[PDB]
């Protein structure tokens, strides 16, 4: 059983409805890590992400490296973000995705607070590098991004980092779906009852 977990960071945004349409057509399920300010701006999209079978998790309030890690606000911000999301979808998600990844920001003290707060942490196994192609002609960018993902998909479980706020990322998804389907992957959302560790610290409590 090969499973590909598409994850989308930093949203919702103005390309997210398009992305949800694409996912629905391919019968694919994915995972979204949302920033607090955008949850407030785009409640309909948050509702729709959950309503269409995708997992909705937290990507912090400020996405500010200094506040999250050095000043130790990571858990406070994930908790706040969690409450905004719960006000819309009617449940409190446990999975967080660290802005800029957990390494080295999420130090041993913060990891304890994550565990104590009942939160999980997912990093990723494949970086799509979609940000490289910002503001470049979308068609060529999307194909490159698809290539970045397809050629790195080698393991039975892959967690793919993309950002749905970039147009070239959303445009890349059709090719990624067809390509990973060829390789024998199914596309699933994260499921809290089926948690397994995916983090740069190899901290199995998270």
User: What gap in Å lies between CA 13 and CA 15, rounded to an integer?
Assistant: 6
Single residue of 110, 148, 176, 177 touching a second copy by CB under 8 A: 148
Nearer to a second copy, 155 or 183 (CB): 155
Among 3, 32, 4, 2, which Cα is nearest to 170's?
32
Query: Interhelix angle for 138-150 vs 167-182, to 10°?
Result: 40
Residue 54 annotated as catalytic: no
Q: What angle do CA 14, 17, 61 make, to 5 degrees?
A: 55
| Pairwise CA distance, residues 39 & 64, whole Å | 17
Binding residues for Zn(2+): 10, 59, 63
Interface pattern 70-99 for Zn ion (x via CB under 5 A): -----------------------------x
- In this structure, is the dihedral angle defined by the CA atoms of residues 170, 175, 181 and 184, taken in order, positive or negative? negative
List the one residue from 27, 44, 139, 192 that touches a second copy (CB under 8 A). Answer: 139
Nearer to a second copy by C-beta: 27 or 44?
44
- Decide: 20 and 64 in contact? Cβ < 8 Å: no
9 catalytically annotated: yes
Distance of closest approach, residue 164 Cβ to Zn ion, in angstroms: 11
127 phi/psi in degrees, rounded to 5 = -95, 120
Stretch that binds a second copy, among 33-41, 52-60, 87-95, 194-202 (CB under 8 A): 194-202
Per CB under 8 A, residues contacting a second copy are 14, 64-66, 70, 100, 103-104, 107-108, 111-112, 127, 129, 131-140, 144, 147-148, 151-152, 155-156, 166-167, 196-197, 200-204
């Amino acid at each position: 059983r090969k499973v590909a977990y598409l994850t989308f960071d930093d949203g919702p945004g103005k390309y997210t409805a398009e992305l949800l349409n694409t996912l629905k057509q391919h019968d694919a399920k994915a995972t979204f890590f949302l920033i607090g300010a955008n949850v407030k701006e785009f409640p309909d999209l948050v509702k729709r992400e959950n309503a269409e079978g995708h997992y909705v998790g937290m990507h912090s309030m400020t996405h500010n490296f200094a506040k999250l890690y050095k000043n130790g606000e990571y858990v406070n911000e994930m908790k706040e973000d969690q409450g905004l999301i719960a006000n819309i979808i009617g449940k409190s998600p446990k999975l967080t995705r660290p802005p800029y990844g957990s390494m080295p920001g999420l130090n041993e003290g913060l990891r304890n607070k994550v565990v104590e707060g009942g939160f999980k942490v997912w990093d990723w196994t494949i970086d799509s590098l979609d940000w490289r192609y910002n503001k470049m002609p979308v068609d060529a960018a999307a194909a490159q991004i698809a290539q970045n993902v397809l050629t790195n998909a080698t393991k039975p479980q892959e967690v793919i980092l993309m950002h749905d706020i970039h147009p070239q990322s959303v445009a890349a998804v059709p090719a990624i779906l067809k390509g990973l389907k060829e390789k024998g992957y199914e596309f699933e959302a994260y499921h809290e009852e089926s948690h397994f560790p995916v983090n740069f610290w190899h901290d199995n409590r998270m």
